Design a protein around this ligand. Structure first.
Ligand SMILES: CCCCCCCCCCCCCCCCCC(=O)OC[C@H](COP(=O)([O-])OCC[N+](C)(C)C)OC(=O)CCCCCCCCCCCCCCCCC
Ligand SMILES: CCCCCCCCCCCCCCCCCC(=O)OC[C@H](COP(=O)([O-])OCC[N+](C)(C)C)OC(=O)CCCCCCCCCCCCCCCCC
Lengths: 171, 98, 69, 140, 105, 120, 175, 80, 347, 115
């Protein structure tokens, strides 16, 4: 029936945040605090477009801003961050409980030298709004014209003509 | 559709031909009935797990549950025969013919 | 999420771009043809992605989560 | 069994003999297998050999019924040169009735069978001619 | 006598589970949520006969989403062609498909 | 086959449109017949329990007559409501679709040909 | 022949079903069905259904431990047949195994059999998802919303089990 | 009712203890003060993603940043 | 049987029937069917007799096979359709399996091999409950899925049911086997018209239920389960002979009785679809049913059989049994013809 | 996969011990060492006679109570649900149904033994 329209491999060729799970988890709160705008833009346009072939620029900007944030982490607070993600990575379940001293040192260093505040419990789980400019897709599901419904019933209920009209029954 | 679907439905009809052709014992037929229900349960669970239908996940186990709620009844319909006949052969179960 | 969408599009493009070089002499086939009447994006099943790769990736990706203890 | 009846009615009547006769024989054989399977199902045969003897008996009787019916219809429609006449089917029905009386070893059964499936064959023929429906599709 | 008392008393007994595109716990979509939505909304209130006669395309797309059988035939055809071309000997797999490929992240 | 009409609003014995119809009069012959049915039922109770048939238990006969008349009146109301619904849907569809049901020009007998078969 | 693990488990399922469908004796039929239920539970675990597979395992173990107790209680013959002590049991077991291998050879050769519906020869893993469900399993919230969303279903299930108890009490009274 | 209670406590204390525990488990959550705390604790767990919304310009409640004071906080469980 | 436990059992079977009536889900339909099974099972074992155990075993096995076929049909419909709404089915094989399940549950031929033994092995009240209340839920399910019902299958099952019921009723002396084969004949008459106008099916079901309940109430009142005792009822009371004569004339299909009301209008909804020979054949088999009915009426009422000397004692005590709404159901079973258009209340 | 390896290793170690226990020592059998054990005398009949077992209802109701367990078993994940009132009310209802079945068994003389 239809044909698929796939993007070229050149457009998808973009450098990546080549890090691990524990490194991403160690700086997760500060990444969610500082870099909320491009991430929320990407999440909103992905939720309202439902098509990854049209959702590439916001993902590119999310990736670039994430790598910029990690570069800013690397320039100022490298060694406490290395200690933090190392002791995070030692634990099997990646528990935030077994890393209190390293987390305290990391947040103190990044607050004193970069002024980022770690969000409290539930602050990252709030619903937000995004000052976007893309138009609202009026037909996001690629549907077609709906069939015409049946006409309703109109008019008064006049009585039956000459009774039931069933065989010899007059009434 | 697939392959495991074919295997499970063929197991169901194999157990159906096992039940529908008796071999002179009631409880063996009860075992074949529970086998047919096993094929039904396996098919339903696999169908749900392929289709990601989360909220219908109650239906297999409950189906399973209700089967036991009749299967014990079949066992409760065995010893009563054993309380009248010495054994539970179906060829002895022909009193209702007059 | 961005990584997952970019990887899915990359794998689908890799599968489509090698479908052309294998099926040429066959008659009456249009390459890359979809089986859906609508042009809307669908979440691809696992056979469309890794249906041309080696089997080690198959048991490390399909059953890999379940078989990891 | 939806193709046996249609293949019976896919050939013009009284034109070719052996194909129509074999089609009617196959329909009779299917009916005989059905009735013999039911007979060995509800009634237990005393042995395997007696059961397959009963199955072969019913198969042979019904196959002879169908073969003689189709044959007699074929030569009747060929001799009278009337394809659209149910009298050929009535004659074939009496031929089948005589066949049933011969295989069952009776005479009054043969005459009653003459009348009964001769009328049945005639009803089939004007059902085909006038387009009657045994299972009418819902219209209103 | 389908006595629909679920609408007479206004009590929801089993309308919350009967359809794949219903409200799900923790908002988890099924594998064919959009196709279910299209098939329901196209074939709503116009009758079953008109729904079958007119809304056949979206129901066919939904059935293809569920069973995926046409994709199975496609994969079978390309895999039989691949096995044949390996067996005669005019095909070589690329390093990306063979495993040594260094995936995107 | 009226189930679609009983699709949106169910388990209603007499809907809002049924009140706009003329109710059956108490002198309707069908109501009298149903009252006779109740009287016969009371006579059958006087018969089968070995009682006098025409005098025993006037309260039972009056209860039977009243109950039969009550359920007969309500069933007749539902019946004429359903028949009025049938005729109204009839006329609505026959206004709605004139292309599939055209008009007929009734010819006179001075030109329509008929074949006369003599009886002799 | 590695990624056909679901196919192999289904073949053992059909083999055990043919084995206990001969109806030789309730203990041996229970053994055959228990092997079949073990590989069916293996199928469900291999499809991610940990809870459903373990539940069908535990339920079947309890139910046919009761069945074992019943066949050792009442329904016993003097010389039970294993599989070969009688002729028709072995005949129908060999027959069922032959048809099982018949569509095995039919599905590994043309990869598309037609028995009522049409069936393919690839493993079911091709239909399994490519997406991740986060920090949770979906069937767990299915059986969790069993109590919240499932009001009428749980009510009728509990009432039916209570009625089963009272019925089973009433049946074996005698007087 | 004291004599009957003493009688069942003397005959079988297990039934008396079981019925006391059952009655406590029935009537105490209906008198509990922390049930609504459990309600908001269960409701406040962030399982799925909190997707944002489109903007028409008229919303006083939702924020543009997670650290903005507008929006719901979670101070009650932090103190408790 | 304990009265409270019996009341709970009756509330369970009516609750299962109501659940099948009101549910819009296939699983709840099957749950109601299972509750119906599990509640009707001890009704047959109220007397604790070996005949009751044989009947219960046969009924339980047949209904279990029907339930498993119903579940397989439901799962096939789910897999090809993805939902659970009680509406038209999306597969012919699921329609086959559900039609076989409902035919097995109803007792329609050739699955009629369990109804006469089950009716014979149980008492009269249990037979009433069976032959009346088990014919409501499968009729509702067939009412729900009539778009997907194959025409040839249901028509073949109907004509086989009527022919087999008449031929079975020609050669039975017991009253309960007569009732079972008459129920098969009425089932075929009722399900032949299902695809053309289901209101005719509902009307014939209502009339059949009223007449069968009337006859079983008369049999309970006379405490008779044999033809000879039914003939002996003439000496005990003449009024009982009058009512058995008029009722068994009503179920024959004679005007102006109420039993001519459904069947005739069945033809009125089958000649509109230009099906002519099928109502004629079913009328001929209705004449066969009328023949065994006429033999039974000759046995009981029109000829007074010789009696014994013991019945004089029974002349000194009136009938103290409770006849539940007997005159109303007799009147509705006899003289409902002049109120024929009342079937329009079933739309 | 690791579960399969553990199962195969356990079965291999189990079936290797009986093979070592059987084919290693010297066998010497007559028609008395293979005889059934009846405390030094011949057995009276066979052991395949039907036992007049007395806890048939207890086994069936064990099955039914195990299905009650199957209904009550997914309760911990229901602790994470939002609608807590319906959860608590119906968990209490199902436990009460279990207790009602047990109490009816207690009153109507079901937990005791036959004969
Ligand atoms: C796991 C950690 C270690 C555990 C301890 C291990 C070391 C000790 C082992 C001791 C020996 C055990 C084996 C031998 C005994 C075996 C038989 C047996 O156990 O029988 C059970 C015995 C049997 O009783 P019985 O044998 O006396 O039965 C007689 C019954 N009547 C009186 C009716 C005739 O007890 C029970 O069944 C009771 C169950 C346990 C009770 C626990 C109560 C806890 C507190 C409840 C609340 C109390 C306050 C009041 C209510 C307040 C409400 C708010
Ligand atoms: C926890 C681990 C436990 C591991 C297993 C136990 C450890 C020891 C394993 C070896 C034990 C000795 C061999 C098996 C037992 C033999 C018993 C016996 O008396 O056998 C006599 C028999 C000889 O007696 P015979 O053959 O005349 O038979 C005696 C019985 N009559 C006379 C009545 C027929 O020994 C053998 O058959 C030899 C066995 C092998 C010996 C070693 C061969 C070379 C191996 C290198």
């Amino acid at each position: 029936p239809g044909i698929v329209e796939l993007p070229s491999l050149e457009d998808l060729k973009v450098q990546e945040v080549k890090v691990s799970s524990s490194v991403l988890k160690a700086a997760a709160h500060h990444y969610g605090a500082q870099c909320d705008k491009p991430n929320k833009e990407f999440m909103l346009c992905r939720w309202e477009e439902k098509d990854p072939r049209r959702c590439l620029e916001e993902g590119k900007l999310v990736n670039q801003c994430a790598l910029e944030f990690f570069r800013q982490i690397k320039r100022h607070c490298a060694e406490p961050f290395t200690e933090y993600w190392t002791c995070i990575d030692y634990s099997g379940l990646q528990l935030f409980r077994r890393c209190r001293k390293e987390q305290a040192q990391f947040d103190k260093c990044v607050l004193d030298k970069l002024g980022w505040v770690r969000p409290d419990l539930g602050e990252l789980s709030k619903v937000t709004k995004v000052k976007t400019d893309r138009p609202l897709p009026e037909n996001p599901y690629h549907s077609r014209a709906r069939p015409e419904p049946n006409p309703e019933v109109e008019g008064d209920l006049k009585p039956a003509r000459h009774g039931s009209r069933l065989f010899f029954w007059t009434m | 559709m697939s392959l495991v679907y074919m295997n499970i439905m063929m197991a169901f009809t194999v157990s159906l031909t096992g039940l529908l052709m008796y071999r002179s014992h009631l409880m063996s037929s009860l075992l074949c009935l529970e086998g047919m229900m096993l094929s039904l349960f396996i098919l339903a669970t696999l169908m749900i797990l392929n289709s990601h239908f989360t909220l219908a996940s109650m239906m297999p186990i409950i189906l399973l549950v209700f089967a036991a709620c009749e299967a014990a009844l079949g066992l409760s319909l065995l010893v009563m025969v054993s309380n009248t006949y010495g054994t539970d052969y179906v060829q002895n179960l022909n009193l209702l013919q007059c | 999420q961005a990584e997952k969408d970019r990887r899915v599009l990359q794998m689908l493009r890799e599968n489509l771009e090698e479908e052309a070089t294998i099926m040429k002499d066959v008659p009456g086939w249009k390459v890359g043809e979809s089986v859906f009447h609508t042009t809307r994006w669908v979440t691809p099943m696992m056979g469309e992605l890794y249906g041309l790769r080696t089997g080690e990736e198959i048991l490390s990706s399909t059953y890999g989560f379940i078989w990891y203890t | 069994a939806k193709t046996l009846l249609h293949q019976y009615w896919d050939i013009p009547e009284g034109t070719e003999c052996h194909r129509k006769t074999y089609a009617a024989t196959s329909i009779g054989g299917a009916s005989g297998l059905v009735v013999s399977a039911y007979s060995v199902a509800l009634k237990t045969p005393t042995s395997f050999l007696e059961g397959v003897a009963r199955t072969g008996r019913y198969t042979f009787t019904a196959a002879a019924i169908g073969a003689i019916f189709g044959l007699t219809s074929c030569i009747s429609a060929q001799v009278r040169e009337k394809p659209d006449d149910p009298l050929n089917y009535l004659i074939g029905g009496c031929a089948g009735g005589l066949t049933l009386g011969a295989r069952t070893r009776s005479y009054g059964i043969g005459a009653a069978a003459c009348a009964y499936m001769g009328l049945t064959a005639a009803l089939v023929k004007m059902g085909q001619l006038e387009g009657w429906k045994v299972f009418a599709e819902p219209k209103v | 006598p389908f006595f629909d008392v679920q609408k007479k008393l206004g009590v929801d007994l089993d309308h919350w589970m009967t359809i794949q595109s219903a409200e799900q716990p923790h908002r988890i979509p099924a594998r064919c949520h959009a196709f279910e939505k299209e098939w329901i909304e196209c074939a709503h209130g116009i009758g079953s006969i008109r729904a079958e006669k007119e809304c056949k395309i979206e129901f066919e797309d939904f059935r293809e989403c569920l069973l995926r059988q046409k994709t199975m035939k496609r994969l079978n055809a390309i895999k039989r062609q691949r096995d044949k071309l390996i067996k005669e000997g005019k095909y070589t797999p690329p390093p990306h498909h063979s495993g040594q490929e260094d995936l995107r992240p | 086959m009226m189930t679609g009409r009983q699709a949106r609003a169910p388990l209603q014995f007499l809907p809002d449109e049924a009140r706009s119809l003329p109710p059956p009069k108490l002198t309707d012959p069908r109501l009298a017949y149903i009252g006779f049915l109740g009287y016969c039922s009371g006579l059958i109770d006087n018969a089968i329990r070995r009682r006098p048939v025409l005098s025993a238990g006037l309260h039972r006969q009056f209860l039977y007559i009243t109950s039969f008349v009550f359920v007969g009146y309500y069933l007749l109301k539902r019946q004429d409501y359903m028949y009025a619904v049938r005729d109204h849907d009839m006329f609505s569809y026959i206004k709605s679709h004139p292309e599939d049901f055209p008009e007929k020009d009734k010819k006179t007998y001075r030109e329509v040909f008929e074949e006369f078969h003599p009886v002799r | 022949m590695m990624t056909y693990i679901v196919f192999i488990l289904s073949i053992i399922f059909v083999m055990g079903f043919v084995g206990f469908s001969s109806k030789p004796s309730p203990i041996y039929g229970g053994l055959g069905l228990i092997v079949s239920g073990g590989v069916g539970c293996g199928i469900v675990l291999n499809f991610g259904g940990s809870f459903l597979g373990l539940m069908v395992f535990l339920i079947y173990l309890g139910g046919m431990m009761v069945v074992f107790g019943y066949t050792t209680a009442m329904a016993t013959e003097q010389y039970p047949e294993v599989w070969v002590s009688n002729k028709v049991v072995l005949g129908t077991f060999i027959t069922g195994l032959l048809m099982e291998f018949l569509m095995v050879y039919y599905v590994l050769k043309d990869k598309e059999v037609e028995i009522v519906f049409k069936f393919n020869g690839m493993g079911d893993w091709v239909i399994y998802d490519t997406g991740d469900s986060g920090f949770f399993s979906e069937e767990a919230m299915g059986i969790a919303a069993l109590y919240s969303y499932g009001t009428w279903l749980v009510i009728v299930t509990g009432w039916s089990l209570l009625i089963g108890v009272v019925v089973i009490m009433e049946i074996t009274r005698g007087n | 009712v004291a004599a009957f209670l003493k009688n069942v406590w003397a005959k079988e204390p297990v039934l008396v203890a079981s019925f006391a525990i059952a009655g406590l488990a029935v009537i105490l959550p209906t008198l509990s003060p922390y049930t609504k705390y459990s309600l908001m604790i269960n409701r406040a767990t962030p399982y799925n993603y909190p997707v944002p919304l489109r903007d028409d310009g008229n919303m006083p409640d939702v924020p543009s940043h997670p650290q903005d004071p507008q929006g719901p906080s979670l101070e009650w469980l932090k103190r408790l | 049987m304990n009265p409270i436990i019996l009341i709970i059992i009756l509330m369970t079977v009516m609750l299962g029937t109501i659940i099948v009536m009101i549910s819009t889900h296939w699983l709840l339909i099957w749950i109601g069917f299972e509750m119906n099974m599990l509640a009707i099972i001890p009704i047959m074992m109220k007397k604790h007799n070996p005949r009751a155990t044989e009947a219960s075993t046969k009924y339980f096995l047949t209904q279990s096979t029907a339930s498993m076929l119903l579940m397989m049909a439901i799962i096939i419909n789910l897999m090809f359709s993805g939902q659970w709404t009680v509406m038209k089915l999306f597969n012919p094989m699921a329609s086959m399996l559900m039609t076989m399940a409902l035919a097995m549950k109803l007792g329609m031929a050739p699955f009629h091999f369990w109804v006469p033994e089950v009716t014979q092995g149980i008492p009269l009240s249990s037979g009433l409950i069976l032959l009346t209340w088990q014919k409501l839920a499968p009729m509702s399910v067939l009412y729900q899925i009539l778009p997907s019902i194959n025409l040839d299958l249901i028509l073949t099952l109907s004509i086989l049911s009527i022919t087999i019921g008449g031929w079975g009723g020609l050669n039975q002396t017991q009253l309960r086997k007569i009732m079972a084969y008459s129920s098969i004949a009425h089932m075929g008459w009722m399900t032949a018209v299902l695809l053309y106008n289901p209101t005719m099916t509902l009307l014939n079901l209502i009339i059949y239920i009223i007449m069968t309940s009337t006859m079983f109430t008369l049999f309970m009142a006379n405490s008779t389960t044999t033809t000879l005792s039914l003939s002996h009822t003439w000496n005990k009371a003449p009024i009982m002979t009058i009512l058995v004569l008029i009722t068994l004339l009503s179920m024959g299909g004679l005007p102006p009785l109420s039993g001519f009301m459904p069947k005739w209008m069945i033809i009125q909804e089958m000649t509109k679809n230009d099906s002519i020979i099928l109502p004629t054949l079913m009328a001929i088999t209705a004449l066969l049913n009328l023949y065994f009915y006429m033999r039974l009426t000759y046995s009981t009422a029109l000829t007074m059989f010789p009696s014994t000397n013991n019945m004089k004692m029974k002349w000194q005590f009136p009938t103290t049994k409770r006849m539940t709404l007997l005159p109303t159901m007799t009147v509705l079973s006899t003289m409902l013809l002049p109120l024929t258009p009342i079937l329009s209340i079933l739309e | 996969m690791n579960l399969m390896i553990t199962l195969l290793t356990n079965f291999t170690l189990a079936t290797l011990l009986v093979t070592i226990a059987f084919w290693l020592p010297q066998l010497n059998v007559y028609s008395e060492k293979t005889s059934p054990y009846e405390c030094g005398f011949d057995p009276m009949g066979s052991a395949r006679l039907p036992f007049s077992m007395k806890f048939f209802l207890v086994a069936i109701t064990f099955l039914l109570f195990d299905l009650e367990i199957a209904l009550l078993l997914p309760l911990p994940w229901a602790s994470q649900t939002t609608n807590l009132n319906t959860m608590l009310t119906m968990a209490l209802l199902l436990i009460f149904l279990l207790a009602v079945s047990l109490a009816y068994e207690w009153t109507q003389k079901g937990l005791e033994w036959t004969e």
